[PDB]
Amino acid sequence: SERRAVYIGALFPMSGGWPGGQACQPAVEMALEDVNSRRDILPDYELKLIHHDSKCDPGQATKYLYELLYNDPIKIILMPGCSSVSTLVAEAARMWNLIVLSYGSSSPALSNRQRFPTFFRTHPSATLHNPTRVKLFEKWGWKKIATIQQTTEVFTSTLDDLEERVKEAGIEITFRQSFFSDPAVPVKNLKRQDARIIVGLFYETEARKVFCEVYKERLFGKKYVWFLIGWYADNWFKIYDPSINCTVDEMTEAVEGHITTEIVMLNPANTRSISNMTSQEFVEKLTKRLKRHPEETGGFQEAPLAYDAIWALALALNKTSRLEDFNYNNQTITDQIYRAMNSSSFEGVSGHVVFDASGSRMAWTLIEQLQGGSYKKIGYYDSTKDDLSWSKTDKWIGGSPPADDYK
Amino acid sequence: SPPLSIMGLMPLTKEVAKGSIGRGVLPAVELAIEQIRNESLLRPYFLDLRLYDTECDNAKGLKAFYDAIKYGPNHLMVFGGVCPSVTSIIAESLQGWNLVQLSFAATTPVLADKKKYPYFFRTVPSDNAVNPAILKLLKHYQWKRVGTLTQDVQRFSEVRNDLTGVLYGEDIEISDTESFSNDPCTSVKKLKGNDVRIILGQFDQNMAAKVFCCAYEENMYGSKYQWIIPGWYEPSWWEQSRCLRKNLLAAMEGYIGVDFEPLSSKQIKTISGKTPQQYEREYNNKRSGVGPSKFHGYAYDGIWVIAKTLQRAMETLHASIQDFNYTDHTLGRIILNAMNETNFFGVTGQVVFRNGERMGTIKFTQFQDSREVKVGEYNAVADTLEIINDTIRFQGSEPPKDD
Ligand SMILES: *[C@@H]1O[C@H](CO[C@@H]2O[C@@H](C)[C@@H](O)[C@@H](O)[C@@H]2O)[C@@H](O[C@@H]2O[C@H](CO)[C@@H](O[C@@H]3O[C@H](CO)[C@@H](O)[C@H](O[C@@H]4O[C@H](CO)[C@@H](O)[C@H](O)[C@@H]4O)[C@@H]3O)[C@H](O)[C@H]2NC(C)=O)[C@H](O)[C@H]1NC(C)=O
Ligand SMILES: *[C@@H]1O[C@H](CO[C@@H]2O[C@@H](C)[C@@H](O)[C@@H](O)[C@@H]2O)[C@@H](O[C@@H]2O[C@H](CO)[C@@H](O)[C@H](O)[C@H]2NC(C)=O)[C@H](O)[C@H]1NC(C)=O
Ligand SMILES: *[C@@H]1O[C@H](CO)[C@@H](O)[C@H](O)[C@H]1NC(C)=O
Ligand SMILES: CCOC(OCC)P(=O)(O)CCCN
């Protein structure tokens, strides 16, 4: 007998807001070679890739989604990268009875089963920071939290989720402030309302502006703890920006002691996953395929999720095991792949891969603290098993964390 | 005759509520197509409008568009797009198939972004087009201080956000900006507290009855107050909890409604040789049992925009069409440049575009005893206001003062 070719219709953003496809396409190519060379996964089938550059643009992606659906061969799954591209393809997909599997989407809105009934993602939702936040609050005894956000759909949704999460844990949000571009008025209000435990969600440019305003208002020190997303560049507060008044020294001062949460994208452990690679081996392997240095390559940190997306699909198809009879007008095979994808449980290069009811990836979070102008690993949190690994590396001026109020 | 194919994208099914817009405009579309064919305006060619049901759904609407490109003839342009989310998806992708689009019913301001939607055009003024009209009304009555009441829904916040830019560099102060999601009463008390006299309201029909209920309770009505709110509500919308009906009508008394003008009031012959009044009679006879749609004139003028566009494009090619696959960038640019030249008097008044946006007519109404009565019109082209003498009224000897 001969192996039947089975096709993935993928979209890789080689440019745009998140040029993740630069490192994610070779990671997908490596994963397909690895799955196809294994005779114990799909011995009867050969997984093949048909792809296009979406440019992280929905309008641009609409042209390629047509190209994938209206040209032979029939695709069994759709694989988009960007959140904006995934929102378009995952909503449209039901009309062609297609499973959608994203390797790079973080938008909380994508975890809606009514709008996106066949959607899965190896990239966790931005809401994954919230159970780690509630756990750090509980450990430190805080029940009063202030929130500050830049106005972006992603941050609004993340804070909306934090609200329902704090309520269950018996914690309340004291004050919520927002800003489009200038954070002068929201930070002044945080001092006025005597906020102590503050969650700040914004991009790098806005973070520098928030922290300049934070210095000028003495909103840093023993009384205050800031919670930020650990996605900034290496010495972000030191980066020169002519739009900000504050100096490097004044600003290294304002950021001192703040806590960050970051989604774990590469298993810190030296264990071997299903491919039998180590986290470190995968990195060495991917760096070789790349024309440019990892630092220059977009989506290098997200590349393990793209590698794991291929394995998640391969294992789901192996459960169902037929595939060549797939048609866009039939729910039968789709519902079976769906059930197999929903039941995913395996070790990947990014760690243990499992999806929640919404189809969103469950993963570890890396907790860090800025100690002397440098981030220090203070622990990890697993939302599913409720287990916190504590390093005993965290430090406070009081010798103990402050408190949410006046006392 | 060779066909000039056009992709008609609109909700048509009775199952979808917005299907009434699509069906309500079809007799008007039929009238324009019939005349253009009779006059042989497009000679040697003929306008071939193919209709595809979008069902007012993102997935169904996208598949309807995709199926039209795959199985349909080679369309030169897109006609339609009613529902905001579906129209945005199609409008953003247009360049991929070098297709110029002309909508007659999509009013969402988002579509004015030519970085995101360069190939999109519309004959209907957007929800923001009421703002340059309101400014003219404020200037006319010497209202230099205003307060705003906005429902926290995208559609309304878009309008309020645009108002900031329109009133900037103008001698008008927004002394109080108030928002609400479910109940306006708290925001209405704050407006009263800050002594707001002229209120610019942006909220739905359901919220409007609540706004006027709070207004009666807080005495924010009569000779001292002027409410300027949306003019697109259903007639007898107020009839459809704490306040009485007589008390709602007392607070509603004298409100100014603002919306686009469905048809020109000028008894002047249009491009078709008919006055807007003559076309309206022709439309009412033709529609038969199908319920009327306020976008009918915009759909009628839309067909004329396409026909006049195809004429200019045909001349440009002759100055130097059948093989237009969606691959011809040059023809798409020719059609795009030809549509930018649109300048004729239609049933909705003068049909002219300013960066894909319609420069049209805005209707001013006033609630008087039992219903909304027309009190004026704003001309966007000339940026002029005409207030109908002996219609608009104030409870006091003078129109209210702003403080
Ligand atoms: C999973 O992971 C490791 C991968 O090993 C290494 O990393 C890769 C990235 C790549 O660099 C690769 O080349 C490299 O090996 C595997 O662990 C290795 O497994 C092999 C097989 O057991 C081990 O080699 C054996 O070594 C013993 C001596 O220790 C030999 O007795 C034996 O040799 C054999 O014996 C007969 C003699 O007649 C020979 O003729 C046969 O060829 C036969 O192989 C092997 O040579 C090797 O030492 C292991 N390394 C480590 C570090 O443990 C592991 O097996 C992989 N799992 C899989 C593939 O399921
Ligand atoms: C797009 O059209 C604008 C406006 O065109 C004018 O108004 C139309 C309604 C129609 O009557 C046209 O004949 C008019 O020219 C163009 O901008 C105009 O360009 C001419 C230069 O030829 C200049 O005299 C005018 O000042 C311009 N008007 C404005 C408001 O700037 C514009 O060039 C066209 N763009 C194209 C074709 O790419
Ligand atoms: C693939 O399926 C077979 C039988 O259904 C099973 O034995 C095998 O372990 C599966 N492969 C993997 C890698 O799980
Ligand atoms: C331009 C930024 O886009 C991202 O966030 C959008 C909500 P994304 O979710 O599309 C990619 C994130 C990769 N970790």
From Swiss-Prot, chain A:
Binding site for 4-aminobutanoate: 83, 106, 123, 203, 302
Residues of the full protein shown: 165 to 576 of 961
Ligand binding (baclofen): 83, 106, 123, 203, 302
Recorded family membership: Belongs to the G-protein coupled receptor 3 family. GABA-B receptor subfamily.
Residues bearing carbohydrate: 245, 276, 318, 330, 342
Function: Component of a heterodimeric G-protein coupled receptor for GABA, formed by GABBR1 and GABBR2. Within the heterodimeric GABA receptor, only GABBR1 seems to bind agonists, while GABBR2 mediates coupling to G proteins. Ligand binding causes a conformation change that triggers signaling via guanine nucleotide-binding proteins (G proteins) and modulates the activity of down-stream effectors, such as adenylate cyclase.
Record's disease association: Neurodevelopmental disorder with language delay and variable cognitive abnormalities: An autosomal dominant disorder characterized by language delay ranging from mild to severe, varying degrees of intellectual disability, and learning difficulties. Additional features include early motor delay, muscular hypotonia, behavioral abnormalities, sleep disorders, and seizures.
Tissue spec. comment: Highly expressed in brain. Weakly expressed in heart, small intestine and uterus. Isoform 1A: Mainly expressed in granular cell and molecular layer. Isoform 1B: Mainly expressed in Purkinje cells. Isoform 1E: Predominantly expressed in peripheral tissues as kidney, lung, trachea, colon, small intestine, stomach, bone marrow, thymus and mammary gland.
UniProt-annotated location(s): Cell membrane; Postsynaptic cell membrane; Cell projection, Dendrite
Entry note about domains: Alpha-helical parts of the C-terminal intracellular region mediate heterodimeric interaction with GABBR2. The linker region between the transmembrane domain 3 (TM3) and the transmembrane domain 4 (TM4) probably plays a role in the specificity for G-protein coupling.
Annotated phenotype, changing residue 123 to A: Strongly reduces signaling via G-proteins. Abolishes antagonist binding
Disulfide bonds: 56-82, 212-246
Residue ranges annotated as Extracellular topological domain: 1-404
Highest taxon above the source species: Eukaryota
Annotated organism of origin: Homo sapiens
Annotated gene: GABBR1
Assembly information from the UniProt record: Heterodimer of GABBR1 and GABBR2. Homodimers may form, but are inactive. Isoform 1E (without C-terminal intracellular domain) is unable to dimerize via a coiled-coil interaction with GABBR2. Interacts (via C-terminus) with ATF4 (via leucine zipper domain). Interacts with JAKMIP1.
Residues that, per the record, bind phaclofen: 83, 106, 123, 302
Organism lineage: Eukaryota, Metazoa, Chordata, Craniata, Vertebrata
Protein name: Gamma-aminobutyric acid type B receptor subunit 1
From Swiss-Prot, chain B:
Outcome recorded upon mutating residue 66 to A: Impairs interaction with GABBR1. Decreases signaling via G-proteins
Chief site of localization: membrane
Places the protein is found: Cell membrane; Postsynaptic cell membrane
Keywords: Cell membrane, Coiled coil, Disease variant, Disulfide bond, Epilepsy, G-protein coupled receptor, Glycoprotein, Intellectual disability, Membrane, Phosphoprotein, Postsynaptic cell membrane, Receptor, Signal, Synapse, Transducer, Transmembrane, Transmembrane helix
Family stated for the protein in its record: Belongs to the G-protein coupled receptor 3 family. GABA-B receptor subfamily.
Recorded domain comment: Alpha-helical parts of the C-terminal intracellular region mediate heterodimeric interaction with GABBR1.
Protein's recorded name: Gamma-aminobutyric acid type B receptor subunit 2
Organism: Homo sapiens
Name of the coding gene: GABBR2
